[PDB]
Ligand binder design. Structure first.
Ligand SMILES: NC(=O)c1ccc[n+]([C@@H]2O[C@H](COP(=O)([O-])OP(=O)(O)OC[C@H]3O[C@@H](n4cnc5c(N)ncnc54)[C@H](OP(=O)(O)O)[C@@H]3O)[C@@H](O)[C@H]2O)c1
Ligand SMILES: CCc1nc(N)nc(N)c1C#CCc1cc(-c2ccc(C(=O)O)cc2)ccc1OC
Length: 157
């Protein structure tokens, strides 16, 4: 299974200055639950922003850098390498990976951040006429999670 995993705002902002524009612990938990025990594929910039591989899952980084060799991280140098990865693979950003993979993935796990943030990187436009809403769940708000958000699972029609 090949899935997109992404949080984007009302205008499809996903990032600003190589970081997430929002602070939303519940979505990090969401990511943790979906991807633990499986595989995350991310572009080089996304990886460097995180700084270290995420625990308890396979971390795969796409880069043209032949010198890239980080402990706890597998490297790939081509999009086509993704298709050789076994198991449930999540395309985990950033903008370049999403643009390169959105027409190839089976489904998308999207957290819609229900606000308008300043961004410099975007999720590509998509239409619900191409995607069935398998599920849509409002995120619960609290003291630590104050931005409204919705968890979508979309499956390609
Ligand atoms: N909101 C979210 O769910 C979410 C999730 C992930 C990331 N983000 C955000 O996304 C932003 C980063 O996105 P970005 O587009 O700037 O960078 P990115 O996609 O994370 O990384 C781009 C790099 O990936 C490598 N790459 C991509 N395609 C390749 C290919 N076909 N062959 C070889 N290498 C390839 C290249 O690395 P080299 O230059 O080293 O060759 C390229 O420079 C950040 O702001 C981050 O916070 C948001
Ligand atoms: C966690 C935000 C997010 N949500 C959803 N639904 N899909 C994604 N692909 C990402 C993402 C991402 C990349 C990223 C993750 C993190 C991050 C931080 C903490 C945790 C964690 O505590 O589990 C996970 C990812 C930090 C920075 C960062 O890019 C700047």
């Amino acid at each position: 299974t090949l899935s997109i995993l992404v949080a984007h705002d009302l205008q499809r902002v996903i990032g600003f200055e190589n970081q997430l524009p929002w602070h939303l612990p519940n979505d990090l938990k969401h990511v943790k639950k979906l991807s633990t025990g499986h595989t995350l594929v991310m572009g080089r910039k996304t990886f460097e922003s995180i700084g270290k591989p995420l625990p308890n899952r396979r971390n795969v980084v796409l880069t043209s850098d032949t010198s890239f060799n980080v402990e706890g991280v597998d490297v790939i140098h081509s999009i086509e390498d993704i298709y050789q990865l076994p198991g449930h693979v999540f395309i985990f950003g950033g903008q370049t990976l999403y643009e390169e993979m959105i027409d190839k993935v089976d489904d998308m796990y999207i957290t819609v951040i229900e606000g308008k943030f300043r961004g410099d990187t975007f999720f590509p436009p998509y239409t619900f006429e191409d995607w069935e809403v398998a599920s849509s769940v409002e995120g619960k708000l609290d003291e630590k999670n104050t931005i409204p958000h919705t968890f979508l699972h979309l499956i390609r029609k």
